Design an enzyme around this catalytic site. Sequence first.
Site, mmCIF file in Angstrom:
data_model
loop_
_atom_site.group_PDB
_atom_site.id
_atom_site.type_symbol
_atom_site.label_atom_id
_atom_site.label_comp_id
_atom_site.label_asym_id
_atom_site.label_seq_id
_atom_site.Cartn_x
_atom_site.Cartn_y
_atom_site.Cartn_z
ATOM 1 N N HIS A 1 2.511 -22.935 28.294
ATOM 2 C CA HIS A 1 2.929 -23.760 27.127
ATOM 3 C C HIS A 1 4.292 -24.446 27.385
ATOM 4 O O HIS A 1 5.120 -24.590 26.426
ATOM 5 C CB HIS A 1 2.995 -22.909 25.859
ATOM 6 C CG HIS A 1 1.679 -22.191 25.504
ATOM 7 N ND1 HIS A 1 0.878 -22.585 24.457
ATOM 8 C CD2 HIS A 1 1.050 -21.095 26.081
ATOM 9 C CE1 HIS A 1 -0.219 -21.770 24.376
ATOM 10 N NE2 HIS A 1 -0.079 -20.819 25.336
ATOM 11 N N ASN B 1 -3.044 -20.070 18.751
ATOM 12 C CA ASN B 1 -3.642 -21.263 19.460
ATOM 13 C C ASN B 1 -4.493 -22.042 18.495
ATOM 14 O O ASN B 1 -4.681 -21.636 17.391
ATOM 15 C CB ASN B 1 -4.488 -20.836 20.723
ATOM 16 C CG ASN B 1 -3.608 -20.489 21.937
ATOM 17 O OD1 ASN B 1 -2.410 -20.800 21.964
ATOM 18 N ND2 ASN B 1 -4.196 -19.794 22.941
ATOM 19 N N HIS C 1 7.663 -14.735 20.030
ATOM 20 C CA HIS C 1 7.045 -13.586 20.680
ATOM 21 C C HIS C 1 6.206 -12.867 19.630
ATOM 22 O O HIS C 1 6.789 -12.493 18.574
ATOM 23 C CB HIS C 1 8.184 -12.720 21.241
ATOM 24 C CG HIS C 1 7.710 -11.441 21.862
ATOM 25 N ND1 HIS C 1 7.132 -11.391 23.095
ATOM 26 C CD2 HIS C 1 7.660 -10.155 21.357
ATOM 27 C CE1 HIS C 1 6.723 -10.110 23.335
ATOM 28 N NE2 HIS C 1 7.062 -9.374 22.312
ATOM 29 N N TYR D 1 6.513 -11.169 26.404
ATOM 30 C CA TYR D 1 7.367 -12.188 25.779
ATOM 31 C C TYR D 1 8.822 -11.799 25.798
ATOM 32 O O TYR D 1 9.664 -12.681 25.890
ATOM 33 C CB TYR D 1 6.936 -12.542 24.338
ATOM 34 C CG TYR D 1 5.624 -13.273 24.266
ATOM 35 C CD1 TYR D 1 5.573 -14.635 23.941
ATOM 36 C CD2 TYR D 1 4.429 -12.595 24.530
ATOM 37 C CE1 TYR D 1 4.372 -15.261 23.883
ATOM 38 C CE2 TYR D 1 3.223 -13.234 24.489
ATOM 39 C CZ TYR D 1 3.194 -14.533 24.179
ATOM 40 O OH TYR D 1 1.963 -15.141 24.118
HETATM 41 C C1 HDD Z 1 0.593 -10.969 28.918
HETATM 42 C C2 HDD Z 1 0.719 -12.239 29.220
HETATM 43 C C3 HDD Z 1 0.325 -13.171 28.114
HETATM 44 C C4 HDD Z 1 -0.960 -13.189 27.457
HETATM 45 C C5 HDD Z 1 -2.130 -12.230 27.659
HETATM 46 C C6 HDD Z 1 -0.724 -14.286 26.488
HETATM 47 N N1 HDD Z 1 0.443 -14.971 26.634
HETATM 48 FE FE1 HDD Z 1 1.173 -16.451 25.365
HETATM 49 N N2 HDD Z 1 2.787 -16.600 26.485
HETATM 50 C C7 HDD Z 1 3.185 -15.728 27.450
HETATM 51 C C8 HDD Z 1 2.494 -14.651 27.946
HETATM 52 C C9 HDD Z 1 1.147 -14.237 27.498
HETATM 53 C C10 HDD Z 1 4.643 -15.913 27.887
HETATM 54 C C11 HDD Z 1 4.824 -15.847 29.394
HETATM 55 O O1 HDD Z 1 5.479 -14.768 27.512
HETATM 56 C C12 HDD Z 1 5.142 -17.141 27.162
HETATM 57 C C13 HDD Z 1 5.695 -18.217 28.104
HETATM 58 C C14 HDD Z 1 7.196 -18.428 27.886
HETATM 59 C C15 HDD Z 1 7.543 -17.697 26.627
HETATM 60 O O2 HDD Z 1 8.609 -17.796 26.008
HETATM 61 O O3 HDD Z 1 6.373 -16.909 26.268
HETATM 62 C C16 HDD Z 1 3.845 -17.489 26.389
HETATM 63 C C17 HDD Z 1 3.854 -18.586 25.571
HETATM 64 C C18 HDD Z 1 2.928 -18.840 24.520
HETATM 65 C C19 HDD Z 1 3.132 -19.895 23.508
HETATM 66 C C20 HDD Z 1 4.238 -20.882 23.471
HETATM 67 C C21 HDD Z 1 5.293 -20.394 22.453
HETATM 68 C C22 HDD Z 1 6.276 -21.491 22.411
HETATM 69 O O4 HDD Z 1 5.931 -22.561 21.801
HETATM 70 O O5 HDD Z 1 7.344 -21.335 23.030
HETATM 71 C C23 HDD Z 1 1.983 -19.785 22.660
HETATM 72 C C24 HDD Z 1 1.647 -20.646 21.435
HETATM 73 C C25 HDD Z 1 1.263 -18.646 23.221
HETATM 74 N N3 HDD Z 1 1.787 -18.139 24.330
HETATM 75 C C26 HDD Z 1 0.083 -18.066 22.594
HETATM 76 C C27 HDD Z 1 -0.851 -17.126 23.157
HETATM 77 C C28 HDD Z 1 -2.112 -16.795 22.469
HETATM 78 C C29 HDD Z 1 -2.698 -17.328 21.232
HETATM 79 C C30 HDD Z 1 -2.646 -15.761 23.395
HETATM 80 C C31 HDD Z 1 -3.929 -15.039 23.404
HETATM 81 C C32 HDD Z 1 -4.359 -14.540 22.280
HETATM 82 C C33 HDD Z 1 -1.640 -15.645 24.464
HETATM 83 N N4 HDD Z 1 -0.529 -16.340 24.229
HETATM 84 C C34 HDD Z 1 -1.768 -14.730 25.585
#
Ligand code: HDD
EC number: 1.11.1.6
Lengths: 725, 725
Positions: A100, A173, A364, A387
């Site tokens: 994202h 999402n 987060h 997160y």
């Molecule tokens: C375990 C790893 C992992 C998994 C399984 C998920 N994500 Fe995630 N997501 C991340 C690891 C992560 C992250 C690496 O932690 C991010 C990237 C940078 C940050 O600040 O958080 C992220 C970012 C992120 C953002 C952007 C937030 C923003 O605008 O800064 C959204 C909207 C989502 N995710 C939503 C989801 C949804 C709806 C998931 C499944 C139901 C999902 N994530 C699964």
Amino acid sequence: LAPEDGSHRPAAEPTPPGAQPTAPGSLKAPDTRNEKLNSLEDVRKGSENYALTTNQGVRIADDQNSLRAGSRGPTLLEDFILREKITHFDHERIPERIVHARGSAAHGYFQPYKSLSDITKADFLSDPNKITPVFVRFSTVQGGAGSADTVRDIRGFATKFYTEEGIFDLVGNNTPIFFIQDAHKFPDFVHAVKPEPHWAIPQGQSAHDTFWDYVSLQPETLHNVMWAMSDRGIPRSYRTMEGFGIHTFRLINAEGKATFVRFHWKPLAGKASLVWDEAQKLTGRDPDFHRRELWEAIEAGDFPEYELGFQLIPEEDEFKFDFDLLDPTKLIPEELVPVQRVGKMVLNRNPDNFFAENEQAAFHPGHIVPGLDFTNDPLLQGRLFSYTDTQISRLGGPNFHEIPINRPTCPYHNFQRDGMHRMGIDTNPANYEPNSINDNWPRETPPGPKRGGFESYQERVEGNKVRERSPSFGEYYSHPRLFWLSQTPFEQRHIVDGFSFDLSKVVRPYIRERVVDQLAHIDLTLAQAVAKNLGIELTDDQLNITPPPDVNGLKKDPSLSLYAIPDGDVKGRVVAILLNDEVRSADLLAILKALKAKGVHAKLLYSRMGEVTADDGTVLPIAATFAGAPSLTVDAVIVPCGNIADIADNGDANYYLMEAYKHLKPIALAGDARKFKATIKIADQGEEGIVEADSADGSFMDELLTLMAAHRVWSRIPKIDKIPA
Amino acid sequence: LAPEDGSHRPAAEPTPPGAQPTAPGSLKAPDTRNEKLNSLEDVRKGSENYALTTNQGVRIADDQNSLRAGSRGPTLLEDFILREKITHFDHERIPERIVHARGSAAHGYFQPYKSLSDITKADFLSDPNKITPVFVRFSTVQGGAGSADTVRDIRGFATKFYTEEGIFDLVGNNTPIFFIQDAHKFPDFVHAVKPEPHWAIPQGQSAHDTFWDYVSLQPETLHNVMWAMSDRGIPRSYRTMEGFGIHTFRLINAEGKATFVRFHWKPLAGKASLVWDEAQKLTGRDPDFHRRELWEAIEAGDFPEYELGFQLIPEEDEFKFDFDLLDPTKLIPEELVPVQRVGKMVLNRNPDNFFAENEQAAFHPGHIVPGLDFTNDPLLQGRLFSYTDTQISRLGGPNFHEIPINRPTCPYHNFQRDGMHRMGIDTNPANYEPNSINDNWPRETPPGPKRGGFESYQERVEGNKVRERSPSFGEYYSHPRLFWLSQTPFEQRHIVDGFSFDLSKVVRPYIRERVVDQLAHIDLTLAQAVAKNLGIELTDDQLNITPPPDVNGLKKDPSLSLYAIPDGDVKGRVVAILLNDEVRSADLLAILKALKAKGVHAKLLYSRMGEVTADDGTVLPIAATFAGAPSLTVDAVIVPCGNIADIADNGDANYYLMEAYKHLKPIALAGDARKFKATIKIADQGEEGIVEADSADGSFMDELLTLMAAHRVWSRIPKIDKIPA
Ligand code: HDD
Ligand code: HDD
């Protein structure tokens, strides 16, 4: 340097898209306030009437030149002003989000419709007169911060609620499921969709081998793949898509009762998507279309609004469905569990500095508040780890909560100290508990009906320590099938087209074949249609694969379609008006006022910039040229009457119509503008989706606005195949 | 999981684009080596036949699941396998480069044509048989690492030379000047071109208010703006652009003599650019076009080749021109100082991992070697500060030279120690000098003719400590005008169009007007043609501004044009062949035979994927559909005969030709394919640029390949206004 007339400066009032230069939100809308926006005042910095300085406050006399020995001589090391200015520039960037990375954000507020104290002690849901400030970031998933907005991808919809009892982040999402079941696979799935490691191609696209290789070997993905291949994958704007938390979470009330919940956002503007050719061409013409659309709607006062809704399931009904509630690859059909309206969120001011507020925001899903809790959804369970971890690098340390946009607006105190970038200066004699030297302050708080400490719901846990997928998660095709059968026929064709396009970019043919086999497990019609597009022939075995079971007796659910149940809304949409050098001013009065009355914006286009003069001498300001602002960026096209010969020969003007025609957009032709009917091959007696009359008066604009309410002219799909456009 | 036939895996021989999946360079071309590529062997990591492990070397049994208490229970904290895997994922990203974030790189080698030891003691130029490994990164400037390739922008062309006497980085651009004079202004200029800070729009584009605001207020920018607004700003490929060091530097010979020098790269594939509509649409259809084209050219054996060239000015001629040699907004016309050919650089292998080799590479114009030196160019002077500084955050510390791509292949030893991620384990008892305890090793080395220490040329410096621009720099119009008058009439038109298009997107009209005023100080015809497109009328005063003086008597210099002097080379170009379901194999034979003889590649296109069978039973695999690989991506289109009825009324097939026609590409139509002449309005007796015949044959191929040697059909320009495409 500013012009005398003060026209360098945007009006501080709502104005439609293109009327005024865009601006920082606090300058554009100083009177739009909320508790969070107000609390950011201590870090907001002005400029006007201030002397230019170093960061140490030393006024700068000459910001045009380095210090050198001689005006043609070498630059001197003692130029501290140069080195400070260059140092800060040299270090402007921070790592983009791992996923994202591309996203656009806004400030707003939330309010519940009624108290939900019977089901949750969450303070922000306790009172319809309690307003919670929000910050919302929408995003794509695969592409870098610098990639294009109208890609085919899932979108992110993340809401930070600044509540009186803590930050609550609802990190969702635009589809109700995710691609995978257990967080341990997230790096595999993401690596598979992202650019391939040898050459870092393709940006913002699933259309490559590794993606389809993984999907073909992991059928748990097929459900969210169906969503991404549909027009869900190419929304018209962040205001016209749905949001979902995906996971089942819990609400906990003051009596300690747990209720399962899935979260929903309903777009008050309705559901609307682009068509693929238009979405792709738009990544070239305006890679910032969604970011722009969002900012301008807010500047115009067309605030994006969303209704929060909850699907609610009694603890005792955990096992009453064909699918597991904890399986994030399964949706809960609204025919089985309706969404209950909870409240309304209005996004009503842009940030001031994108980097500071948007790029540095940290969301987060582990950021919950008393009144909410988790479940054992094994995808959610892993997210809780990720997160917090990722912020230590992305935002440089454990004090990311002190970056202004992230700060709670409620009290925060604890014994945590130091870390890089530490802003708070703690005066507590104690940095530990239990302590006597500060009488044990700050103190723990027992859980309670309001303002109490967080306690986890005491769910029974029973089992062996295992790395094992639940057998209940081992079903992959029925949900895909359910989504498919709920789509309109034109939606189904667009899904077929999305799979066919993506798989055509897969170089290894065996991967295409393997995905086609997977489709034959979902629906024979889908599988055959994609196969025909790929010149693949299904085997007799594949032709005989039994379709998967319905989902608890459902063979379709219309809440899963974008369009099956019309929910159109025209306010905030945009109409291209193709001018000529002697426009009928009566047509134009009738056209603009009718649009204005419905909150529909207009863009006056010509073959050059500047002005043209109408039949009666009205001077008409031109917003953009036909090539400069293509049909991709509008919802419908109107051609008023006048000297049509002026533009009848303009390939750009004709092509404008053909492109808008191909993408199913309403077109209206007044008076001699009907000469353009020949370009789009329209019959004499007319065709539905083309408004035509002698003038723009009477029913002409009402008929056009009726088409706009229905978004696109789906009945035209058979007719567009002949058009070379 | 691989298929039976081994066809998951690419052939490790050269193959044309699309014939095989792309692969890491060392797997694709394992026999292609050089001293640097070999030296990377200590860090290359294979994979076949190895067990999957943690980073600590522990074999993993189940990489599909988190550890949980029961198979539907919570994830456990003791799952170190999950947390290591997710932690590494969570920290993948590093800060992208402040500028030139988007770029594509390859390995290769350089060698001089003859010894240059009379003018330089630089070891890499000392011997025609001494080969120097290189790593080259090409880039855009403004956009992020995930922005599109075929934007309008300046391009970067950075060459790291791994010499026997040190890394030399020649860090240039694809135009011979920069926008600004003094490094102190770089953050102002870059911030003005970058996305605007309130909303972070637009990505990869100068077409916005802040850019044109800065330009209109800083006329020193006009020269590089002219080059950016021309077709220079949209190259066809990184293989078909020029490169320049911009600054005057010094060559120092063994006798101590300094000669001023400017560096040039001449593309041996010739100079070739896109047209705007094509370039902008291509940012949507394939935002990775230049990255892909470069990777594929290398995989095919079409190695990019460049000739290094020097403009040489004796020290006593420093003041003999009517511009300052130290002013990086001024070029040295080749009519005045010719480019002396120096050596040839061949790019012949792709990297293994984009992130490890391309994203982490660090180039810096301060990395010089004995035999080279700097000058007082005040832009060059400040660059020397910034490239070392920026690496500290971007690459995490001062040990960035230990990152494998950045390591010297020659010895490096000194007394520097520690720093984050220190790899080198120093055994030296001493970490300071002078020391007795290690007999002062490693030791200083006096300067001399070869293998000597670095000593600065002892330039005389005389002047006071001033922040002042040299008066000699204060001329802004004569080089923009020279460049203008040196362009062909079609190139001039495209420049006018580029200015008109950018300025049309400037919201504040006074900014457009101020820029047109600036144009009126360069050339009236250019100012008027831009004005007209903007609906602006020049004042009397503006119509009377005296043209700036000629540049040392020059009224034009044809070397400044892309096209005025033919230098086209078709090898590595690509032709779309539009197939039908009964292709005349005699046409296909003749086409492919002639294409193969000139190293021109082909792509076989159809209305679906899979296979078609020719009239003689030959099975033809389909590379892409008409819609899926548009004409944007090829240099010419051939339509063989056969069953033309199959594609004659296909809208996509017709559109393909209309697009290629609009964008001035050669089209060849054989037999009944001549019926397509209808969609593009070609005279019965034909048109220069459309090749036609009863059959595809010797003469037909010749005519087509001659047109391709000329790149585009400029004579068709008057005719493309009418086509709606
Ligand atoms: C375990 C790893 C992992 C998994 C399984 C998920 N994500 Fe995630 N997501 C991340 C690891 C992560 C992250 C690496 O932690 C991010 C990237 C940078 C940050 O600040 O958080 C992220 C970012 C992120 C953002 C952007 C937030 C923003 O605008 O800064 C959204 C909207 C989502 N995710 C939503 C989801 C949804 C709806 C998931 C499944 C139901 C999902 N994530 C699964
Ligand atoms: C004083 C600041 C400054 C100024 C005046 C310039 N640049 Fe620069 N340039 C940088 C500061 C910089 C940088 C911030 O230091 C970068 C970004 C990160 C990095 O490693 O270097 C950079 C990167 C960068 C790259 C990318 C190298 C790569 O692929 O990694 C190229 C090709 C150039 N520059 C070329 C130029 C040329 C031809 C200039 C004018 C003649 C120029 N720069 C002026």
